[PDB]
Design a protein around this ligand. Structure first.
Ligand SMILES: Nc1nc2c(ncn2[C@@H]2O[C@H](COP(=O)(O)OP(=O)(O)O)[C@@H](O)[C@H]2O)c(=O)[nH]1
Ligand SMILES: [Mg+2]
Lengths: 99, 234, 51, 239, 131, 257
RNA sequence: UUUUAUUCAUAUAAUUAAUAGGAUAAUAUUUGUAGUUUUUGAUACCAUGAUAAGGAUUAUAAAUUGAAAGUGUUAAUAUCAUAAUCAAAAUUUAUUAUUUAUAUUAAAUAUGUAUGUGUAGAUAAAAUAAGACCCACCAAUUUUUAUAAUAAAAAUAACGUGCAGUAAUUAAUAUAUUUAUAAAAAUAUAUU
């Protein structure tokens, strides 16, 4: 009748390059195909991709906020010519792949 | 750790035991099977000189308290302050009546001695009383002796004493103290009396041990009665 | 002891009821699929005959 | 001030006072301290199927199920309600059949009216759902049998008549088995205007107190539009 | 490490403080001190708390014993003694009245008072419902 | 007893690289015998000698049991047998023996049955059965075109009309589905399509044969668009599978079949 | 310009569970009473009590031969009620208060080495039937102002350095000046 008790003494220590990834497609079918391809892509030894936000819109402000705020390397993928409405500026450490 | 002893008498009796106890021991069964405070304190104290008792400090302290519980000190203070007044002056008559009322209230117990002393010090520090006392002292022949003797007599008449004739012995003590020239007649030490009354609510003027030592507590000790170097009694 | 046995027995009963419900849903799905397959076989043979 | 740093009790003085008093009324009354006793504390077991409970507890669960159905408040088809009511009546029927003292003649007025309203509701739901469900008349017949078991001729005859009529009804039924105008006129007028011929939204931002602010397009005559049109870096960008 | 000088006094005391031999709060310590019989908060400024202090809770099984003690005392007393002393069924009657003087360490003195019944603090009382 | 910096820490990742202190190679909370200075070992051994404890023998193996304690001075390395981390070690051992030691709330009634008893159940709607007039009438009522008493009456009133057929063009990549649809529609889309690859489903109605409308759905043939293929399969009533003559049956054609 | 003394000697070795009566008694072969084998803290650990050191003060004068020793605490130690792997027979092993110049070993085996003009430092003893809380840096994170190659403040349970108030170790404080890896002070006045 008891659940596992967390312990906060243990913390995450980074061994690989943690790539925070945001994905945004032009259409829902494109988004599904992109997600399937990304999950079919195998993991490298020293690379770990964390998928935060997947959407059907263009580049937003919250995407830049989620990817660029943390110092971890970030990749934002824009599948299709979806119009962007972000007012901030994407940091240089974050790669924006518009395709 | 520590066993429960329950020294309370209400924590060691229960109705179940009391039911059987009452039948054997009750009021009827017990009845069937069984068959001037100063003077009383003094006789209690002196009865310790019997062949089966000892002189104890408790009884002497008790009789001392019974003897000193009165306020005749304050009454004599008031009447000695009254003695110096002039029976002809109207201000002196007013002061005399005020102080007589104060003394009567103290004797009756209607006024506590602390506030009575406040009244007395306020009355005796007034300039009128000081001037009257100054004239009394300056006069070549004065009425201080007559005043204090009449004060003793009225203290007897009005019942302001513990016993009818104690006032005259107190007057004798007052005169023999006046022979010492401690203070001018009519100028009592108010600071001294204030210091007295701040602490005491009422103004006033081979070892024996209750717990014998045990063997565990005291290693090498015999007792208070044993004599290590006795003599030869005839 | 009473609370523990009550909680455990209620949990067991609820789990059994949920499993029975899921089994009923699975049986319904299987029956619907079988009917669909029968209809599809009839449609296929009808299609061959009509062609 | 409040707490003492010294933790040792010195000898001399320190005469604490212990005073004990007692009233006979306290011993007589003894007040009350029964929070949870063995009589009121019992084991609890749960069964999923409603046939495991005794008829009384079966009814005590059926009333809760009826309350849940009322909370649903769908009404309309009431075959589930009819089944619940039939089980409720079966509780009384099995109470009488097993050998309990419960008999409709011996039942008091409250239990009698409860039985009457239960059977009436069951029959009403069954009559409503007879056409939708071919087997609702079966529950009607079962309710009539329950009434006969309870030996209540007055309700039994009514149940028999209503179930016969329900069977006949089921057999016979189974054997039988301005805004728009304004919009249209406006659309027609718009189409006619378009055939004969052969405004722009302004973005709004709620600034403060939810007050809208409209950013109207800049006038075409000012220099700022041309300033934006001109290249940023003349040496690097194409002209 | 046998013949070593050992930790300094300051270092050892600081280590004990870090480990927690010093209590974080004084409420438990002064509740078990036994110098006073007040409850844990040590300060009552509300009417209900004051009533709680003035009327300590007691179990019925012990209230019956307390009433039986005065019943037995009155039974032992004679009719004339009771009538003169005004000890009747309605008037309360005292049972015990004494003074004691205690000397020694605070915690041990408190435990001794608990054992003797002089300290009514830190007592568990079963719950009651309604009246 | 608690392994967390007393001062409030910030971001552990620099704009480009990971902070060495928070990396695995330079973990601040791991005692590294290969990089610690002489004074750290001197302090550790001095403590182990001042208080009764075992001699430190191997630093590499001691790093396994080296417990980290944050201090204003910095990291404090305390042996597993040192009294300072006694409570922490006891809690860690208890967690290792039995981790599930926190009570959890009792689960309530099953949500599936709660759905059966939901007050809003009747508002649920379902796709109309194409062969059931009762279903069509019920959907009409739920859309509010007929009253609830018109269900059985409109069930007979429902009639069937032939609709334009929908055909989905499927196949393998570069098998000419786009080119076939392009020829049918006379639009030249196969050349203006970016990258020469179809990645969006398009439905186009054409007037062919006996002046009838046929709606063609251009399903992409790339392997990733399985969801688009499934959508086209569900939507269409007829499927045309185009296979190249030169290039035989491929896995995409096999899965389409 | 009051009296006295002080060289002091044994010290580790091995195995520990039950009751059962007799002569002069009116009778018991119970003379001679026969059911292996599932438990485990000290051959080496019980922390708690006593003890050591050790103090208090009223008895006028007459009579009487009389009317006269009392302990906390701090300490050390230990064999007791409390926490499993090991001292008591095979003793070398060094443990304070001893016989100094006429005669010196006979009953349980009962001491052969220090004469040196009685010459140090320390130590013990008695007036008794005798006679006198808490500061600065360093370390360690981090946070704000700032983006200038800035700069500054501040929050922080265990480090390393120097020694900082609390009548407190030093009259105190303030201003100004000076030295040291930059802590602490010094120097010179003013105030109280
Ligand atoms: N010769 C010939 N070429 C064809 C035919 N169908 C398609 N192609 C070639 O295929 C290319 C277009 O491929 P596409 O139809 O978009 O590939 P798909 O969408 O996967 O079917 C064009 O460049 C044509 O040259 C055909 O029937 N004959
Ligand atoms: Mg294509």
């Amino acid at each position: 009748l008891y659940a596992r008790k967390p312990d906060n003494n243990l913390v995450r220590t980074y061994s690989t390059q943690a790539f925070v990834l945001s994905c945004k497609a032009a259409t829902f079918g494109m988004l599904q195909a992109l997600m399937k391809s990304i999950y079919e892509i195998p993991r490298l030894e020293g690379i770990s991709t964390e998928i935060k936000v997947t959407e059907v819109g263009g580049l937003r402000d919250y995407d830049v906020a989620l990817i660029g705020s943390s110092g971890q390397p970030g990749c934002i993928l824009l599948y299709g010519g979806c119009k962007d409405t972000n007012t901030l500026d994407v940091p240089n450490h974050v790669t924006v792949i518009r395709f | 750790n520590f066993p429960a002893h329950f020294i309370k008498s209400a924590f060691t009796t229960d109705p179940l035991k009391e039911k059987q106890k009452a039948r054997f021991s009750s009021g009827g069964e017990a009845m069937r099977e069984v068959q001037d405070t100063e003077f009383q304190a003094l006789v209690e104290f002196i009865e310790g000189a019997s062949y089966d008792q000892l002189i104890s400090g408790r009884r002497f302290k008790k009789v001392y308290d019974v003897l000193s519980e009165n306020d005749d000190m304050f009454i004599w203070l008031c009447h000695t302050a009254m003695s110096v007044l002039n029976p002809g002056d109207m201000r002196s008559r007013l002061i005399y009546n005020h102080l007589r009322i104060l003394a009567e209230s103290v004797a009756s117990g209607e006024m506590t001695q602390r506030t009575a002393f406040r009244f007395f010090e306020s009355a005796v520090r007034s300039p009128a009383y000081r001037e009257i006392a100054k004239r009394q002292l300056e006069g070549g022949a004065a009425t201080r002796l007559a005043g204090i003797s009449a004060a003793a007599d009225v203290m007897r008449r009005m019942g302001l004493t513990r016993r009818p004739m104690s006032s005259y012995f107190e007057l004798y003590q007052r005169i023999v103290e006046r022979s010492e020239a401690m203070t001018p007649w009519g100028f009592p030490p108010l600071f001294q009396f204030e210091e007295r009354l701040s602490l005491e609510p009422r103004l006033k003027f081979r070892r024996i041990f209750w717990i014998p030592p045990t063997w565990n507590r005291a290693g090498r000790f015999l007792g208070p009665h044993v004599t290590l170097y006795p003599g030869m009694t005839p | 002891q009473r609370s523990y046995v009550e909680r455990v027995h209620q949990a067991q009963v609820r789990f059994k009821a949920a499993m029975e419900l899921e089994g009923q849903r699975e049986q319904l799905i299987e029956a619907h699929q079988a009917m669909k397959e029968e209809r599809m076989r009839t449609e296929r043979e009808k299609r061959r005959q009509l062609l | 001030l409040r707490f003492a740093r010294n933790w040792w009790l010195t000898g001399g003085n320190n005469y604490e006072l212990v005073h004990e008093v007692g009233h006979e009324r306290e011993a007589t009354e003894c007040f009350a301290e029964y929070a949870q006793d063995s009589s009121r504390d019992v084991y609890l077991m749960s069964t999923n199927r409603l046939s495991d409970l005794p008829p009384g507890d079966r009814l005590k669960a059926i009333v809760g199920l009826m309350r849940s159905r009322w909370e649903v408040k769908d009404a309309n088809r009431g075959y589930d309600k009819a089944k619940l009511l039939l089980q409720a009546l079966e509780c009384f029927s099995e109470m009488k059949a097993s050998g309990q003292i419960g008999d409709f003649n011996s039942l008091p007025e409250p239990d009698q009216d409860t039985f009457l309203q239960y059977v009436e509701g069951c029959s009403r739901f069954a009559q409503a759902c007879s056409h939708s469900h071919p087997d609702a008349v079966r529950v009607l017949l079962r309710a009539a049998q329950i009434c006969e078991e309870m030996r209540c001729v007055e309700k039994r005859d009514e149940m028999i008549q209503v179930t016969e009529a329900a069977a006949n009804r089921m057999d016979r039924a189974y054997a039988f088995s301005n805004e728009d105008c304004v919009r249209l006129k406006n659309t027609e007028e718009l189409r006619r205007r378009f055939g004969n011929t052969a405004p722009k939204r302004v973005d709004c931002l709620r600034i403060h107190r939810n007050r809208p602010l409209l950013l109207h397009p800049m006038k075409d005559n000012n220099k700022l539009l041309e300033l934006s049109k001109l290249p940023a870096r003349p040496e690097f960008d194409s002209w | 490490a046998d013949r070593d000088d050992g930790l300094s006094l300051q270092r050892q005391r600081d280590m004990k403080v870090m480990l927690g031999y010093l209590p974080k709060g004084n409420h438990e310590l002064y509740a078990a001190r036994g110098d006073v019989n007040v409850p844990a908060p040590f300060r009552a400024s509300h009417p209900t708390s004051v009533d709680r202090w003035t009327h300590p809770q007691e179990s019925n099984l012990e209230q019956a014993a307390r009433g039986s003690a005065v019943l037995a005392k009155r039974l032992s007393m004679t009719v004339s003694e009771m009538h003169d002393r005004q000890e009747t069924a309605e008037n309360p009657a005292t049972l015990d009245r004494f003074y004691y003087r205690i000397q020694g360490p605070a915690l041990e003195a408190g435990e001794l008072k608990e054992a003797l019944g002089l300290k009514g603090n830190r007592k568990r009382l079963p719950r009651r419902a309604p009246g | 007893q608690s392994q967390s910096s007393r001062g409030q820490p910030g971001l552990q990742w620099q704009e480009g690289v990971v902070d060495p202190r928070y990396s695995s190679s330079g973990n601040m909370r791991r005692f590294n015998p290969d990089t610690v200075a002489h004074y750290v070992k001197a302090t550790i051994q001095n403590d182990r000698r001042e208080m009764g404890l075992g001699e430190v023998y191997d630093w590499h193996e001691f790093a396994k049991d080296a417990v980290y304690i944050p201090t204003r001075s910095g990291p404090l390395w305390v042996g597993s047998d040192d009294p300072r981390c006694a409570k922490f070690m006891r809690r860690r051992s208890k967690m290792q023996k039995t981790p599930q030691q926190k009570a959890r709330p009792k689960p309530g009634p099953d949500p599936a049955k709660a759905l059966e008893d939901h007050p809003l159940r009747e508002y649920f709607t379902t796709a109309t059965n194409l062969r059931d007039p009762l279903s069509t009438a019920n959907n009409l009522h739920r859309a509010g075109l007929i009253r609830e008493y018109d269900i059985k009456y409109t069930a007979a009133k429902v009639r069937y009309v032939p609709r334009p057929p929908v055909v989905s063009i499927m196949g393998h990549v570069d098998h000419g589905k786009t080119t076939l649809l392009d020829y049918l529609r006379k639009t030249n889309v196969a050349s203006q399509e970016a990258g020469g690859i179809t990645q969006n489903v398009g439905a186009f109605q054409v007037k062919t044969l006996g002046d009838t409308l046929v709606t063609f759905i251009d399903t992409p043939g790339h392997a990733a668009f399985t969801t688009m293929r499934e959508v086209g399969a569900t939507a269409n009533d007829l499927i045309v599978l185009v296979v190249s003559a030169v290039d035989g049956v491929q896995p995409q054609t096999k899965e389409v079949i």
